[PDB]
Design a binder for this molecule. Structure first.
Ligand SMILES: [Zn+2]
Ligand SMILES: [Zn+2]
Ligand SMILES: [Zn+2]
Ligand SMILES: [Zn+2]
Length: 224
């Protein structure tokens, strides 16, 4: 699967979500260049106004574009599952608030890497930082800690995202993640390691739709 990522790969993202009964959809398009751990995407809410803050969707909205250093190539599960793909499931628990449960299939459709997601959010506070839109439009750098899940022929990840609240505080979003291959072939089961991420959120000045432009760089580290 790593062979599929030596060049620039078009990406499509499609999400359907329901947060406390507020249904919405997001479509994204862009490209990835895993050689450089680089992603550039534009996401649009196709149903109107997004009912949650864009930063809370960043992690849900293709870790196969991570740059794995040559010395860690044997630990890249994500590319090894391609093209048939993988299922990526998360529970994202927002401290003192609700949670998202996500299910995604990440796979090739022809030359395009597609991330198709269903998101369900429950138990959110109408006056909280998420439904109340009190989060800043930015995204902090962080680490994603990966371990093998041999019994499921996949991986698990754990990490904490810290969303900045407008008043100066932070909204923690605890992430628990499981990935399992869709095809019945072999994959790479990694040693413990992490992914180091940085992300820049912007706007398209001519876009009147509710949207997010995202530039992300991700690099694997942790094994020498
Ligand atoms: Zn609504
Ligand atoms: Zn990301
Ligand atoms: Zn505000
Ligand atoms: Zn601030």
């Amino acid at each position: 699967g790593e062979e599929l990522f030596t060049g620039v790969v078009p990406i499509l993202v499609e999400l359907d979500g329901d947060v406390n009964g507020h249904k919405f959809s997001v479509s994204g398009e862009g490209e990835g260049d895993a050689t450089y751990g680089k992603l550039t995407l534009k996401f649009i809410c196709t149903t109107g106004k997004l009912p949650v803050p864009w930063p809370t969707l960043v992690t849900t909205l293709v870790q196969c574009f991570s740059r794995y250093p040559d010395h860690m190539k044997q630990h890249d599960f994500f590319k090894s599952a391609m093209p048939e793909g993988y299922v990526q499931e998360r529970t994202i628990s927002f401290k003192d608030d609700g949670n998202y449960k996500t299910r995604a299939e990440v796979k090739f459709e022809g030359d395009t890497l597609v991330n198709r997601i269903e998101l369900k959010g429950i138990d959110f506070k109408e006056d909280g930082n998420i439904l109340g839109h009190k989060l800043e439009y930015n995204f902090n750098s962080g680490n994603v800690y990966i371990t093998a899940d041999k019994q499921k022929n996949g991986i698990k990840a754990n990490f904490k995202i810290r969303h900045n609240i407008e008043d100066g505080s932070v909204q923690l979003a605890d992430h628990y993640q499981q990935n399992t291959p869709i095809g019945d072939g072999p994959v790479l089961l990694p040693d413990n390691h992490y992914l180091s991420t940085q992300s820049a959120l912007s706007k398209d000045p001519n876009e009147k739709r509710d949207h997010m432009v995202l530039l992300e760089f991700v690099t694997a580290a942790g094994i020498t």
